[model samples]
Structures are given as structure tokens and as C-alpha cells.
Target: KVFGRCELAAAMKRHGLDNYRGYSLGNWVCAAKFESNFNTQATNRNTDGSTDYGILQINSRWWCNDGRTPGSRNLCNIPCSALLSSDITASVNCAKKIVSDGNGMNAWVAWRNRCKGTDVQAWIRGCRL
Candidate 1:
């Protein structure tokens, strides 16, 4: 049941998603574009060289695979693979939950501002979510 790029994008679009409350579709797209090139299967190097990775650029060591029952990985509440597998709806839901959790969104929006756009940084500041 793995979806593809088009399927993922479509699913995300239908969710009425916005990266940050103040962010627009373009901003979200910009983050997606830069983070993983809109690829649900993107990975990156964490400073420690452990290769923190995922579609949403999640780091398994820190974010999903550590303590707890099955770790962040076992939490079926919002499956990361569902998003990585190309079900953007599922992915968006997963991502939204992660971001909405406060800590997660902070990293993402910061990344977006730092790498995605300078103005994005300033814009995010002093703006209520």
C-alpha cells in the first residue's frame, strides 16, 4: 500500500496543511522541496554522524528509536512509514502530530527558516501560532 510522489503530494494538499500557522502553501512546499526535495524517502547527516533520517528528515536515534515501549518507532498513533511510504495523507497526519507536539515543530520551522528562507525566520518571529 505504498503510495508515490504524486499520491503523497495530493494527500498533503487535501489536508489544508500549512507548515506554520503563518506559513503558506508556498512556504510549506519550500520546506518540503529543501528538506527532501519533496521525496518521502529523504535522509540527512546529523552532526554526530549517525545519519538522522526519514521522509520528514526525522532522526531515528533521537526522535523515533530510543526509549519507551517500542520506542518512537512502535507508536502506531502516527506511523512515519505511512508518510514515508507515500501516503501523504497519512504522512501529513504523522508530521502534523509531530510538529504540533511543540518541540518537533520548533526544529522543523527553525530548519525551514535557516535553510528554506531568511524571511521565513523573521516572519515566524513575533507571530502567534
Candidate 2:
């Protein structure tokens, strides 16, 4: 794994991702479980098995097309370029972004509102980007 609790916590502090992190590992766990089952070497495949990659399971050709073929190694290790340019940080940051961008956490809160207890007012403070 590129990031453990310390690393993720540090990154969350660096970025404004504590909204996700303030809820503790809940956000991280959901992301990892949904993304690659927390498998650092996870690879997604079609039935034909032509597009095997690592971690975020990015396509090899996508890296090649972006002239990042050589950097694919780094990409696999760090999936999101928007992060610290490292594989682990990238992956964690990817998860953080998704959660913050209304895709993960927002959806989750919406679902909880309809299903479980609804407490949307629980703000995640102390996150300053």
C-alpha cells in the first residue's frame, strides 16, 4: 500500500480532504473497498483480458497515449496525477477527491438520509486548503 493511516492523515491535512477524513476511516474504507478491494496491485480485466494494469487499473494504452508509458510504473503506484505525483498519494487523493466531489460522500449522505439516521449537519471542520 502506498499510504497507511499516517500518510493519508498527512495528505488530508495538506489538502482540504478532512471533510472525508474527519469521519475517520469510514471514507477511506469505502473508497478502497469500492475501488480495488484495497489491493495495491489490483488489475481490472475484460473477459478477453487485453487491458491489464495495476492499482487503479488504468489502461496501459492510456498511459502510452499520454506519453506517460514510462511513467505508467509511477501511475500504477500512484493512480491520480492530481495528487502528489506519487502512486500511493495519488490513489488516496483520488479517493478523497471522489468523496469530496459529491460522488461518494454526498451520495452516501443522501442514501443515509433516506435509509439510516440522517445527520447532514455534522460538518467536518479544521480542514483548510
Candidate 3:
């Protein structure tokens, strides 16, 4: 499922992403924009035989089980396939785990480089609530 920017904001807010872990809505919205363009099935393959999954682009190397990555952690304790579902329940839960681990939003390179330290208000502009 591909989400419009504001649609995504409302969804994330409902899922407890508003000011989550001291990260503003702008940060989350910006991360979604740069990571996967709000695509539920989005994926990116890494040369290390790991893949990024879902709207947040979670990595198989640590967050989800792909039965392939060497010493995979699967800290989210979820199968990678769950992240691809349009429902987003599993994906949202997993992303929360990552941030709740104290990594903040730095877990995603796209976010760290492009969204972090930037004035992200533009990412949430015009989104109601």
C-alpha cells in the first residue's frame, strides 16, 4: 500500500508515533518519506545478503528473520514477510521496537542523513492533527 503523506501522518499518530521517544512527528514523517515513500511492500537488497523491509525499511540483518542473514538477531521477533503486508500492524510494531531500544531514529541511514538535524516541520505541514 502506498500512502499519501498526510494519510501516513494520521496513521502513525494513531499508532503512537506522535512525539515518540522524543522524536517529533516531522522526524517520523521525514523518515517515511526518504526510507520508502510510504510503501508497505517496499524493499531494498543489501550486498550483505540482507534486505530492508516495509515502509520503515527495517533490515533483515537485525530486526526480522529472513532465514538468510548470518547471525540474524530478529530482535523484533518477527518474520520479514509480515513487514510487507499492507495492514502495517506488524511493521508499526517492529519499528517501535527499534526505536524503543534507545537507538532513536538513527537505525535508518536514510533518516540519519536526510531527516536528522534538519528542520522537519515541512514533512508534516498541512497534515491535520
**Candidate 3 per-residue lDDT over residues 1-129, each given as its tens digit:** 999888988888888888888888889889989999999899999998899999999999999998889877898899999999978778888988898887788988999999999999898899897
* Ranking 2 against 3 by lDDT, winner: 3
- Residues 82-103 of candidate 1: C-alpha lDDT, one tens digit per residue: 4355545554555565566656
Model 3: residues with Cα > 4 Å off, grouped in runs? none
lDDT tens digits by residue: candidate 2, 22-105: 445334333433444445665554443324333333344322122334434332334333322344555444445444544455
**Residue 97 in model 1: lDDT:** 55
TM-score of each: 0.55, 0.36, 0.94
User: Cα miss at 55, model 1 (Å)?
Assistant: 3.9
- The residue ranges of model 1 lying beyond 4 angstroms of the native Cα positions read 1-10, 45-54, 61-80, 103-105, 114-129
Candidate 3 has its poorest 10 consecutive residues by lDDT at: 86-95
Best by lDDT: 3
| Rank by lDDT (best first) | 3, 1, 2
Q: Show pairs that collide, candidate 3.
A: none
Q: With candidate 1 superimposed using the best TM-score fit, by how many Å does residue 75's alpha carbon deviate from the native?
A: 6.1
Query: Which 10-residue window of candidate 1 scores lowest in summed lDDT?
Result: 66-75
